[PDB]
Write an enzyme that holds these catalytic residues in place. Sequence first.
Site, short mmCIF file in Angstrom:
data_model
loop_
_atom_site.label_atom_id
_atom_site.label_comp_id
_atom_site.label_asym_id
_atom_site.label_seq_id
_atom_site.Cartn_x
_atom_site.Cartn_y
_atom_site.Cartn_z
N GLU A 37 23.27 21.12 1.39
CA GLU A 37 21.82 21.06 1.14
C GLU A 37 21.03 20.99 2.43
O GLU A 37 19.98 21.66 2.55
CB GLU A 37 21.46 19.85 0.26
CG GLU A 37 21.97 20.06 -1.18
CD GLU A 37 21.16 21.06 -1.95
OE1 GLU A 37 19.91 20.87 -2.00
OE2 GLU A 37 21.74 22.02 -2.49
N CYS A 202 14.55 38.03 -15.72
CA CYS A 202 14.40 36.58 -15.77
C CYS A 202 14.55 36.03 -17.18
O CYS A 202 13.94 36.50 -18.15
CB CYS A 202 13.03 36.17 -15.20
SG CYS A 202 12.74 34.37 -15.19
S1 SF4 Z 1 6.97 34.95 -12.95
FE1 SF4 Z 1 7.87 34.01 -14.85
S2 SF4 Z 1 9.11 35.68 -15.88
FE2 SF4 Z 1 8.60 36.39 -13.75
S3 SF4 Z 1 10.46 35.81 -12.53
FE3 SF4 Z 1 8.96 34.04 -12.33
S4 SF4 Z 1 9.45 32.55 -14.06
FE4 SF4 Z 1 10.53 34.55 -14.48
#
Ligand code: SF4
Length: 224
Positions: A37, A202
């Site tokens: 870390e 994501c």
């Molecule tokens: S803006 Fe929202 S959907 Fe896009 S990568 Fe970041 S957390 Fe994920």
Amino acid sequence: MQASQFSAQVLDWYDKYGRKTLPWQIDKTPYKVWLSEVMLQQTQVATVIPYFERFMARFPTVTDLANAPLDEVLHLWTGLGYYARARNLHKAAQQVATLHGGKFPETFEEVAALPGVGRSTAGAILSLSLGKHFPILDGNVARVLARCYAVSGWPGKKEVENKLWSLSEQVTPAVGVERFNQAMMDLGAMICTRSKPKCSLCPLQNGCIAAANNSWALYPGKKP
Ligand code: SF4
């Protein structure tokens, strides 16, 4: 997004795509997690791996590190930059040898008391190496949370910082805390990047407020 849905989607993502083969994730110990870390705080993972391996080969235990001369530690650090990190690394190793018998302490207050270890680094050491139930908040993790929940404001303001720590505590689960906390670092490092985040990759894209409004540039806020 409901916090239980947040945690489940992030753990499901980690299971299939998360990083699990970094050296400080194999046969984990509080010493190995602490050392990694501190090196990772201001340095990219590819640069760190050879330094981490050289430090573990020369200093197999925190007592070995404590008993070494500071100049030898600083020589081995050369090229990582930000040498206050290394000075504090050596002092913290001496504190563990002197106060804790050479074994890493297992309470949040004693870990946070170490030089160079703040609230997030202490939670990281205890959650990732022993499964204790603490959340984290570095710049990567803060950017994912601020975009998903639309937290504007500069986190250098106390009230904003406190809102982000409360959100992190809320979405961080107890079951699987080690997987979740590494997954959030992975997401902020490789997917929810400062510029042009990869929302299609994501696992939060179905509930993220920034993705719904294409407004990721607003979160977190910048210094005024
Ligand atoms: S803006 Fe929202 S959907 Fe896009 S990568 Fe970041 S957390 Fe994920």
